[PDB]
Amino acid sequence: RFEVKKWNAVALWAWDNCAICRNHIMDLCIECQANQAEECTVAWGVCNHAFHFHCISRWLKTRQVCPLDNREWEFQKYGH
């Protein structure tokens, strides 16, 4: 017979517009959609989310984490 002295198990946490302002992913920025005449380019970050430069500028000026995945936001500068 055999006996178990220790063990390790594994599992995955299995579960898309601009969630922060909820406008359509390719659409414009609601903050500036109130003040019609649309200047926010989309911003990408290492954590692989796409948000509006306006949204992110404000939010980051408030807090310094990615609002979607709890990591320090890093403006993606690869390929640029």
Binding site: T41, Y78, G79, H80
Partner: protein, 64 residues
Amino acid sequence: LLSCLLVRILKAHGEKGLHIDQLVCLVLEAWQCTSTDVLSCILHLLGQGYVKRRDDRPQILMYA
């Protein structure tokens, strides 16, 4: 495949092109891969000389 999709996307926009991030969004939407993979394809194409970077507006990219 990513190269030809990006080529088609750049050709469709003509002399207007796009900011690179917008183009990444377009290709990722057309996929249904990582943003970095698309950027790698973009860089290889740029090295091949098919596309160039707009000197006046470095944000956007211009096909040639």
